[PDB]
Amino acid sequence: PAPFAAA
Amino acid sequence: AAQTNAPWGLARISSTSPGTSTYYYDESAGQGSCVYVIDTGIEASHPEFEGRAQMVKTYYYSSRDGNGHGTHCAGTVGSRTYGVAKKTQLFGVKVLDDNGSGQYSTIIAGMDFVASDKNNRNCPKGVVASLSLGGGYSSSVNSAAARLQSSGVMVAVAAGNNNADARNYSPASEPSVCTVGASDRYDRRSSFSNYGSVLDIFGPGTDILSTWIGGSTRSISGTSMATPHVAGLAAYLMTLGKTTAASACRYIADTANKGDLSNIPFGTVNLLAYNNYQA
Ligand SMILES: [Ca+2]
Ligand SMILES: [Ca+2]
């Protein structure tokens, strides 16, 4: 589930 | 070639020492290589990409990067000012939505897409994929990353930003890819960077200036920022003929700056990506 945010 | 007043991470990748500001690199600059940025997309119209970026796949209503993260990562790979490999071809694969999230099923499909799609592209110096993404451990995600690597693509993945052992995250924990931790401009392990035996290498990840959407720029931090330094470095080294997609992670580790980083936990490599460029 997902990466490490919008950043 | 010398780029003065470069982002610190570019200067770091071409230096034995921290604290310098010029990026030095062979002018070949990754020409003839290709890097897939598997992320939220790439704003290909950004002047910084000079026509060398294009979207090739999306799993959402648009191929537009409505987030910025993918554009930033692509910029670190290959933008003219902010990139490691300033003449590479960039291909965007939008597996993450505009909130920066994606289902593992979509991420897997995107990896398998790249493994095939490279056969539709002209990349005589080789192919790299940069995956600034991940979540909890998944054998299926790791297997997809392993297939992509096996297919002849240099796969670089983020270690993750949990200040934890990367063994519990994917695709970070897939042994056969290049798992990238983050450092800061003072050669400290970035506070958030994952660590552990599965890490192959560190790259600059704290306060990294790169492209952003709306034709802009900004500085952000993460193992997401370290990963494209390594992906761009691989493309650059492959263009020079120094290594291949199968061997580039090992080559980068072999030729890294050794022992420069602080707060590296016992059992994690103390290796910082370095281009070993000598003018
Ligand atoms: Ca020094
Ligand atoms: Ca590895």
What does this structure look like?
Chain B: Residues 7-279 form the Peptidase S8 domain. Chain B: The active site is at residues 39, 69, 224. Chain B: One of its GO terms (molecular function) is metal ion binding. The complex is a heterodimer of chains A (7) and B (279). Chain A has 7 residues and is low in regular secondary structure. Chain A has no helix or strand. Chain A is elongated. The termini of chain A are far apart. Chain B is an alpha/beta fold and 279 residues long. Chain B has one domain (1-279): 3-Layer(aba) Sandwich (Rossmann fold), CATH 3.40.50.200. Chain B has helices at 8-13, 69-78, 104-117, 139-150, 223-239, 248-254, and strands at residues 2-3, 23-24, 33-39, 53-58, 89-94, 126-131, 135-136, 153-158, 169-170, 178-183, 201-204, 208-212, 216-220, 257-258, 271-272. Chain B has a 7-stranded parallel β-sheet with strand order 4-5-3-6-8-10-11, sandwiched between helices. In chain B, helix 2 runs parallel beside helix 5 (223-239) and helix 3 (104-117) runs parallel beside helix 4 (139-150). The termini of chain B are close together. Chain A binds chain B through residues 1-7, and chain B through 39, 67-69, 72, 96, 99-104, 132-136, 158, 160-161, 220-225. The structure holds calcium ion (2 copies). Residues 175, 177-179, 200, 249 of chain B line the site of one calcium ion.
Strand content of chain B: 15-25%
Structural class by secondary-structure content of chain A = little secondary structure
Overall geometry of chain B? globular
Radius of gyration of chain A: 6 Å
Please give the CATH architecture of chain B: 3-Layer(aba) Sandwich
Element pattern of chain B in H and E = EHEEEHEHEEHEEEEEEHHEE
* Total beta-strand segments of chain B: 15
Strand numbers in spatial order across the main sheet of chain B: 4-5-3-6-8-10-11
| Major pleated sheet of chain B | 7 strands, parallel
Discrete helix count of chain A = 0
Look at the helices and sheets of chain B and give the structural class.
alpha/beta
Binding site for Ca(2+) 2 (chain B): 16, 260
Family (chain B): Belongs to the peptidase S8 family.
EC number (chain B): 3.4.21.64
GO molecular function (chain B): metal ion binding; serine-type endopeptidase activity
